[PDB]
């Protein structure tokens, strides 16, 4: 769990299709949208935690996606002071959805985190995510862009 620096180890998930779009999910009972992310549990590899949270939050199996890329280093963001674990450090994965859209299901776990989802244009998340994640999102999308665009060519 939380290390000496106060950062929760965490995985984030960018799911794309072959049309230049990424999966944008609406936080349960809120108005804000974001990518799936979740904490790495003790004893888990990052990839393991990614596939677990992928099913918990989005209903998808390993069999429904393929991993296209991951970020090389932890990306860190600090929580707003009033919203306090002082932050999260994240490994990000780029997944292509190869099964049908209908496989996405926000209710496979007993604690759903999203109401639902839609496809959005590739550069929509950077300016739509909550302010304190923007710098991480900017970096993530920059690292993933060439791969997503190659699928859309
Ligand atoms: C356990 O579930 P996990 O799936 O394992 O971990 P998590 O999604 O990273 O949890 P959390 O939603 O709290 O993390 P975040 O940094 O987004 O959010 C952590 C804190 O920031 C708040 N927050 C995150 N995004 C927000 C937004 N767009 N608007 C307002 N508050 C927001 C959450 O309410 C939470 O209290
Ligand atoms: Cl297709
Ligand atoms: F979670
Ligand atoms: Mg989560
Ligand atoms: Mg979760
Ligand atoms: Mg979790």
Cα(103) to centroid(ligand 1), Å: 24
Closest ligand 1 atom to 80 CA = 21
**CB distance 90 to ligand 1 below 6 Å:** no
**At what resolution in Å was this solved?**
1.6
State the distance between the two ends of the chain, measured CA to CA, in whole angstroms.
41
Cα(81) to centroid(ligand 1), Å: 13
The answer to whether the beta carbons of residues 15 and 58 sit under 8 Å apart is yes
Residue nearest (by alpha carbon) to ligand 1 atom 22: 83
DSSP output for the chain: ---TTSEEEEEEEEEE-SSSEEEEEEETTSS-EE--EEEPPTT--HHHHHHHHHHHHH---GGGEEEEEE-SS-EEEEPPGGG---EEEEEEEEEEE-S-GGG--S-SSSS--EEEEEEEETTSHHHHS-GGGHHHHHHHHHHHHHHHHHHH-
Cα(150) to centroid(ligand 1), Å: 31
């Amino acid at each position: 769990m939380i290390d000496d620096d106060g950062y929760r180890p965490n995985v984030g998930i960018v799911i794309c299709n072959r049309q230049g779009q990424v999966m944008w999910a609406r936080r349960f009972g809120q108005h804000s949208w974001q990518f799936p992310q979740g904490g790495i549990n003790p004893g888990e590899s990052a990839e393991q935690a990614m596939y677990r949270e992928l099913f918990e939050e989005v209903g998808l199996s390993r069999k429904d996606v393929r991993i296209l890329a991951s970020t090389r280093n932890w990306l860190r963001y600090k929580l707003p002071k009033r919203l306090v674990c002082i932050g999260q450090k994240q490994k990000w994965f780029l997944l292509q959805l190869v099964s049908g859209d209908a496989e996405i299901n926000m209710q496979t776990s007993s604690t759903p985190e999203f109401d639902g989802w839609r496809w959005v244009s590739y550069w929509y998340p950077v300016r739509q995510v909550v302010s304190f994640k923007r710098d991480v999102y900017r970096r993530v999308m920059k690292e993933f862009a060439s791969v997503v665009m190659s699928l859309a060519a």
